[PDB]
């Protein structure tokens, strides 16, 4: 622990200025307290200050990067470089996306090197994952820098991804963090671009509603999805509405379809509601997951909730 650090943890210098750190920038990176000063100090410093403390940064990155305070300066550093400092940085995070991406502040130096940098370098960062795909969208930290990618960067520029999901979307959809990463891609390519991942969504869409997470991207189209896209849903879900209604994730999946759904499918979904007797009463409002299926048929109907309304606890 450098004598200066020392002191300033003891209180020693309320007045210490960013050119004091000189040869001591790394070291204070890593403190608690240094690494709040530099934060503080950079915002307002010199074009003096700036240029040495980032090429102090500069000589220890990967490990500044990587580190709980450090990070932080990196950070701030992508807010306040200058555009070739930024860049400079950014060459760094490029070098070492692979490891990085899986650790838990590498995650946050990545996502804030998207927003900082140039387009030409976001694309060259998020292109260094080509090859490596799965591993981190499966990965805890990874799937936030994959979601991160995908917000940022041209659609167009998103096409190994669809590529690497081909033949994987039940498995990464039925994954707490793959699923995630589907419902990002879903929101920013384009339904055409996606096209190959509806065709193993509507493959497996019943394996999908029945699943922890996985219901959850089955409902995301729901709510954003082609009409078409909705409707090929909703129809497979005709028939089934009382089966479906007392699973615990299922149940999650006929609500959005009858919220959802469009006038002349919602009366399909309510009507197949006010037929059966054994399962009006009992089952459809016993239940604690299909009760909420009829709630919401009452949210949306008119001369027809009047007929239904023929349910009573």
Same mark, same amino acid.
């Given at each position: 622990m450098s004598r200066l650090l020392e002191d300033f943890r003891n209180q020693r210098?309320?007045? #210490?200025? #960013? =050119?004091?750190?000189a040869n001591h920038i790394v070291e204070f990176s890593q403190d608690q307290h240094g690494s709040r000063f530099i934060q503080q100090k950079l915002? =307002?410093?010199?074009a003096a200050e700036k240029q040495m403390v980032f090429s102090e940064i500069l000589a220890a990155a990967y490990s500044l990067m990587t580190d709980v305070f450090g990070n932080y300066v990196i950070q701030k550093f992508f807010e306040f470089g200058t555009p070739e400092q930024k860049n400079t940085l950014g060459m760094q995070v490029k070098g070492h996306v692979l490891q990085l991406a899986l650790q838990m502040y590498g995650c946050r130096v990545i996502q804030k090197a998207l927003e900082s940098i140039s387009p030409e370098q976001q694309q060259e960062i998020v292109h260094e994952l080509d090859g490596h795909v799965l591993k981190c969208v499966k990965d805890q930290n990874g799937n936030h820098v994959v979601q991160k990618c995908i917000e940022c960067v041209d659609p167009v520029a998103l096409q190994f991804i669809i590529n690497a999901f081909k033949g994987q979307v039940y498995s990464l959809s039925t994954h707490p963090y793959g699923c995630r990463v589907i419902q990002r891609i879903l929101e920013h390519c384009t339904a055409e671009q996606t096209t190959p991942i509806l065709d193993e969504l509507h493959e497996h869409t019943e394996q999908l509603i029945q699943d922890q997470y996985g219901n959850y991207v089955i409902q995301h189209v729901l709510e954003h999805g082609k009409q078409e896209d909705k409707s090929i849903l909703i129809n497979s879900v005709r028939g089934k509405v009382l089966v479906l209604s007392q699973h615990k994730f299922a149940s999650n999946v006929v609500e959005k379809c009858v919220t959802h759904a469009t006038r002349g499918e919602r009366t399909g979904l309510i009507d197949e509601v006010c037929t059966f007797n054994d399962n009006a009463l009992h089952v459809m409002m016993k239940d604690q997951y299909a009760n909420y299926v009829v709630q919401k048929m009452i949210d949306v109907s008119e001369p027809t909730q009047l007929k239904k309304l023929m349910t009573k606890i």
């Open positions: 210098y309320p007045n #210490l200025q #960013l =050119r004091d750190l915002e =307002r410093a010199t």
